[PDB]
């Protein structure tokens, strides 16, 4: 009722980049090449056996994460030697470690501990005293290098916190120099109103897709939300798989006129899918022979290449997860986004939030960020935004539905080699 009678349909709630006309048109995915970013590491494309984690394996994965990031930072900063975190230090020493909270609550400036890696510290921890640090921004699981002293052997006092070093951007090949600008419409779940299971917002978005004919449509989960009031109280008369199959058929068949490449990203809130992160791609739907080349069932997180433009995307609410734990000396979202980019992982928070199941071997294998993406799609319960963080266009299109009321989606234009202005324009628009 409330959604159907909305009056702000099509309103542009946020804008960035070159001004464009009131109407956006795309190439219908004609001269479009969508693939997974070809990096050294193989992508997650199939289910991996889970529910069996050895504490030793988790220890090894965390330790190697710290060690690898510290090695890269040491080469970049020309640091001579790292020192064990636990040992006393009367003079200033450089220490590599990861941040954490001394208790189970939320991190605060008086509850910070630094845990070293196995190579340099035997995994030992030390309390941290942030009284002598003038500026800082710390979240649990953050790999840091600090110059400080430990006079009592019991409390590390940092004096310098080395800044993060983001990965270099992608240097596109000339193969896509002559390709036109590409239009991407991105939306995130939930796709149905809190009190309905009819997917009205999804129908409106599909109508928008057919109207504007974008080159890529990135749909992020959930598609059958686990927190939907109907799902939790067991009022559904059909199986979860059937509802999800109906939703996917609606999406794929309804986009036939647009000829738009669909990129489907699962969510941890998908009640019908495996609850593990990194999430494998959906595998319960077989597109018809006429839609096989258009539909891309990708994994969470995903690094996509679109005519040379690298788009990073994750369904996980990274900003909400890290905002609850980040502590700063004095834009918060920009700080968190820079933290994500500099840590070079799509989920650097450790321990994770209570709402995400992390398989740490798969996390090690499939969460490293190959490069710094040209566009980074990070849907969040927080407010929509389009930010420029260290040259990367971070887009939060919100969620298509916000409770009983309609939500928002985003549309942006990407061209490889433009001007670094790989993102010509971007807009958060209302549904």
């Amino acid at each position: 009722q409330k959604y159907g009678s909305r009056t702000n349909r099509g309103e542009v709630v946020t804008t960035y980049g070159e001004l464009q006309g009131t109407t956006w048109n795309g190439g219908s995915g004609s001269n479009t090449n969508v693939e997974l970013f070809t990096s050294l590491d193989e992508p997650l494309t199939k289910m991996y056996k889970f529910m069996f984690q050895k504490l030793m394996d988790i220890r090894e994965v965390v330790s190697i994460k710290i060690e690898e990031l510290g090695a890269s930072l040491k080469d970049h900063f020309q640091i001579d030697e790292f020192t064990s975190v636990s040992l006393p230090a009367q003079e200033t020493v450089t220490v590599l470690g990861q941040i954490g909270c001394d208790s189970n609550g939320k991190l605060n400036s008086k509850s910070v501990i630094l845990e070293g890696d196995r190579e340099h510290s035997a995994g030992m921890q030390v309390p941290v005293d942030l009284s002598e640090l003038k500026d800082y921004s710390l979240f649990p699981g953050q790999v840091v290098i600090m110059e400080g002293t430990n006079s009592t052997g019991r409390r590390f006092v940092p004096t310098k916190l080395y800044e993060g070093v983001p990965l270099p951007f992608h240097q596109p090949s000339k193969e896509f120099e002559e390709c036109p600008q590409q239009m991407v419409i991105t939306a995130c779940g939930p796709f149905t109103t809190s009190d309905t299971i009819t997917y009205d917002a999804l129908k409106d978005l599909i109508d928008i897709v057919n109207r504007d004919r974008p080159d890529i449509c990135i749909l992020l989960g959930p598609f059958l939300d686990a927190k939907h009031e109907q799902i939790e109280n067991l009022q559904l008369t059909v199986t979860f798989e059937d509802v999800f199959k109906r939703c996917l058929k609606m999406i794929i068949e309804g986009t036939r006129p647009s000829g738009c490449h669909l990129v489907i990203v699962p969510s941890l809130r998908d009640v019908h899918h495996d609850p593990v992160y990194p999430q494998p791609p959906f595998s319960c739907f077989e597109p018809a022979k006429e839609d096989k080349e258009r539909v891309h069932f990708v994994a969470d997180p995903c690094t996509l290449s679109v005519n040379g433009v690298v788009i990073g995307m994750t369904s996980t609410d990274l900003l909400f997860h890290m905002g609850a734990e980040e502590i700063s000396s004095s834009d918060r979202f920009s700080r968190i986004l820079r933290h994500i980019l500099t840590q070079r992982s799509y989920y650097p928070l450790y321990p994770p939030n209570e709402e995400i199941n992390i398989d740490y071997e798969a996390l090690y294998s499939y969460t490293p960020m190959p490069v710094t993406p040209d566009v980074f799609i990070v849907p969040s319960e927080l407010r929509y935004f389009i930010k420029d963080v260290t040259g990367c266009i971070c887009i939060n299109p919100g969620r298509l539905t916000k409770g009983l009321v309609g939500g928002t989606y985003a549309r942006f234009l990407v061209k490889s080699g433009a001007m670094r202005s790989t993102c010509i324009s971007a807009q958060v628009v209302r549904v």
Partner: protein, 182 residues
Amino acid sequence: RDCERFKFFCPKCGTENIYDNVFDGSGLQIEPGLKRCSKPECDASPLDYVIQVHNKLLLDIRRYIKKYYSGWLVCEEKTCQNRTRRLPLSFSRNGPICQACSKATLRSEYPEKALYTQLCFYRFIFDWDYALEKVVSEQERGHLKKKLFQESENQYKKLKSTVDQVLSRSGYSEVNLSKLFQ
């Protein structure tokens, strides 16, 4: 004996039904658990709402997987009993060293064996053939190995297929024999 039993609320009467075996009752009065509601005044058959049973089973499996991946650790020392989500990299020969007392090992609150046994139990409470062979007696087996229960057998097979599918994706739980023998 330490596994949670399958709780299903009747859609009609709303009374909880606890399922711990494929079959309920003794002798010729034995029938599959999902044939009749636990409330005598209730005539609703849970086998009618098998879609709801499937959905509740999937939700329960999600709940147990979430419990396992929460990664809660408790100190084995009675005088410490420190409970943390964070796994420290400082290990003794027995496992992670508790950072509250620095003298005892942290044990998983919900180990992999617990989740594996829970999934195996959910498979057990829907294993028609196993119940017939092992649990059920001779006269009861004869009474249950006839018609009038074929539909219930098919529905139970479908419900067991879900737990089998979940277990097929479990590593427990995996031993790589290549790493052992070289």
